[PDB]
Every structure is written in structure tokens, then in C-alpha cells.
Enzyme design. Structure first.
Site, PDB file in Angstrom:
ATOM      1  N   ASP A  96       0.842  -1.190   0.000  1.00 61.15           N
ATOM      2  CA  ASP A  96       0.000   0.000   0.000  1.00 61.15           C
ATOM      3  C   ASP A  96       0.881   1.245   0.000  1.00 61.15           C
ATOM      4  OD1 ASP A  96      -1.928   1.891   0.293  1.00 61.15           O
ATOM      5  OD2 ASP A  96      -2.416   1.404   2.378  1.00 61.15           O
ATOM      6  N   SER A 111      -0.678  15.654 -11.901  1.00 55.94           N
ATOM      7  CA  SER A 111      -0.910  15.287 -13.285  1.00 55.94           C
ATOM      8  C   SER A 111      -1.172  16.545 -14.097  1.00 55.94           C
ATOM      9  CB  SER A 111      -2.119  14.358 -13.361  1.00 55.94           C
ATOM     10  OG  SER A 111      -2.531  14.118 -14.692  1.00 55.94           O
TER      11      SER A 111
END
Length: 330
Positions: free
Chosen positions: A35, A199
């Protein structure tokens, strides 16, 4: 040193991936959920409340000659999905894919929430976010990667998750045969303890690319892609009959639909998520309403590039003094 381990989807939807991890001496192999959005290595154990164990493999520290109680240390974690676990702490030897760390904090669960009990395939979590998020008190502990970093050939790990198939986690090296083209690296902020990046925009299907900054985290422990409501609405508007259902808890779409791809930007590069990766199947057995793999982050507080996005790429988690993320197509 290096390590390399195969990671395998737990079910036919790729809801999560499990990677075998050797703990203790002799080794006890548990299948952990790696994770990158958390920083605790915790396991089902011989200390876990018996009614809360249902098929998981447990770590028994009393059977490990290298286990040592970390005296006074406790842990307690709550995840973004509302699940939680807590317990005490041992140090022990932990190996992943041939890479061994001695003295790793292994957090033994005394209590786990129902969603963990109900998932017999996941024996615990191995956190790969920054150690500042580790919950051990009163002495915070380091992640497996943080402990291994100095010994690794290069201070990196890579995630190569499969679509409906096994993939690979590598430590200490970048497998140049595992991706196509070049890797585009992008800056990381560690201010919240995550692999947080920006992004450069998105496209829906064959549509034009929208240049816009989308801050989010690269999170292998989250199944879906969670993005701003504007972006998610633009995606699902291209699927006839798709709608947000408050009763189901997100966007659903007719199972008869063909889904468009979704592209996200990494610098000037582009990662394309095929439409099929966005199909999470019937909302309940036999239903013709299917659950979408792109969902709004509006109720989370952070955008999350979970497995839906990451499995479309070869992803480099560069843990150099100034961390960065790398993405390549594959």
C-alpha cells in the site's frame, strides 16, 4: 541488494493485489497488500481476536526465534475507506522477493475491522508511503522500504500491476524490459506523507486533451481512480445511461456499454487507461448495472490515482533524497 516479488489480484475484478512476504525465523509467509498510501506493516496474528479471524494466515511471533516484542509500542490506523486495525508491535526479520530487512517493525493486530475479517485473502498490509505516516506510538517506526533503502542498489521500488493478471513489485532496480518507451519523472511532495504529484491533465476516449493540474497521490492500496467531480462527470457523460447513484455510492453504468479509455498526463507524456480497466462489474450478482472505476474524489479531500490508473503504467517510486515518481507505458 535487490528484491523482486510477484503480486497477484485477489479476485476477478482486481480489487486488490497480494504479495507474499516472509516474516520471522523459520519464515512465516503471509500475503500482504502493498500500500503506497500508508506506512504501517501490520499482520493478522496469534494475538488477533479470534472472532475477527476468518481464513487469514496469521503471524505467530512466539514461533519465530528472531521476534522481539517492541516494549510499550502500540499502533492504531484508520484508512480512507473507513476500515481500521490496531495492536502491539514486534521487530522481526522480513523478506520480500529475496530482499531481507532485519529489525523490521511488524505490527501485530489485536483488533481488525469487519472489512478485513471478511476478506480472507489479505493477511495484512505492507505500507510504502513515507514513514512520517507510521502510527506506532510512542516511537514511530520505519517502513520496509525505508529500512531497506540504504542496502538497495538504487533507492527505488517499482509497481507493475497487472490487469486481470499478476504483476511485479521490484526493489532496488528498474527493469528496463518491463515497459515501453521512456519513463517520465515528475515531482513529489511529501508534505502529507504520500507519493503526491500533479498530473498535467486528461482526455476522455479519443477526445482532446485538457491541460489542467490535478494534484493527487499514487496509491496502490486503493482500487479505483478518484478525481475531481468535473473530470469524472466529463468521463461518464460519454457513456450512454451512466449516472451517479447516491444509493449505490457512485457512478454506475449499463453493463451493456462499451467504456471509453481515459488518459492522464505525466508531464508531456500520456498514460492511457483502456475502457475495460474501468469496468468493475455488476453492483450485485445478476444486476445489469455495473460499477464504474473512475469516481469522484469530492468527498475524500484528495485525488487518488489508485490501481485503475497505476495498472496502466510501469511506476517508479524514487526514494532518493528528493523523491520523484516515474511513469511509463507498458
Amino acid at each position: 541488494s535487490t528484491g523482486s516479488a510477484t503480486t497477484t489480484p485477489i479476485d476477478s475484478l482486481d480489487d486488490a493485489y497480494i504479495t507474499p512476504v516472509q516474516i520471522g525465523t523459520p519464515a512465516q509467509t503471509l500475503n500482504l497488500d502493498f500500500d503506497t498510501g500508508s506506512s504501517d506493516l501490520w499482520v493478522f496474528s496469534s494475538e488477533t481476536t479470534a472472532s475477527e479471524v476468518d481464513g487469514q494466515t496469521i503471524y505467530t511471533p512466539s514461533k519465530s526465534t528472531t521476534a522481539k516484542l517492541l516494549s510499550g509500542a502500540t499502533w492504531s490506523i484508520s484508512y480512507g475507506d473507513g476500515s481500521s486495525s490496531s495492536g502491539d508491535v514486534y521487530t522481526d526479520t522480513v523478506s520480500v522477493g529475496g530482499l531481507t530487512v532485519t529489525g523490521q517493525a511488524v505490527e501485530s493486530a489485536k483488533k481488525v475491522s469487519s472489512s478485513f475479517t471478511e476478506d480472507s485473502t489479505i493477511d495484512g498490509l505492507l505500507g510504502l508511503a513515507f514513514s512520517t505516516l507510521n502510527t506506532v506510538s510512542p516511537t514511530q517506526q520505519k517502513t520496509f522500504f525505508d529500512n531497506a533503502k540504504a542496502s538497495l542498489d538504487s533507492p527505488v521500488f517499482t509497481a507493475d500491476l497487472g490487469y486481470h493478471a499478476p504483476g511485479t513489485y521490484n526493489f532496488g532496480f528498474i527493469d528496463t524490459t518491463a515497459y515501453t518507451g521512456s519513463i517520465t519523472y515528475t515531482a513529489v511532495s511529501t508534505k502529507q506523507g504520500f507519493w503526491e504529484w500533479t498530473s498535467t491533465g486528461y482526455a476522455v476516449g479519443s477526445g482532446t486533451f485538457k491541460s489542467t493540474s490535478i494534484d493527487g497521490i499514487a496509491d496502490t492500496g486503493t482500487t479505483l481512480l478518484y478525481l475531481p467531480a468535473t473530470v469524472v462527470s466529463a468521463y461518464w457523460a460519454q457513456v450512454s445511461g451512466a449516472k451517479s447513484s447516491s444509493s449505490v455510492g457512485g457512478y454506475v453504468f449499463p453493463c451493456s456499454a462499451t467504456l471509453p479509455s481515459f488518459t492522464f498526463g505525466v508531464g508531456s507524456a500520456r498514460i492511457v487507461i483502456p475502457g475495460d480497466y474501468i469496468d468493475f462489474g455488476p453492483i450485485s450478482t445478476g444486476s445489469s448495472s455495473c460499477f464504474g472505476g473512475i469516481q469522484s474524489s469530492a468527498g475524500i479531500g484528495i485525488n487518488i490515482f489508485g490501481d485503475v490508473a497505476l495498472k496502466a503504467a510501469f511506476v517508479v517510486f524514487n526514494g532518493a533524497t528528493t523523491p520523484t515518481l516515474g511513469f511509463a507505458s507498458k
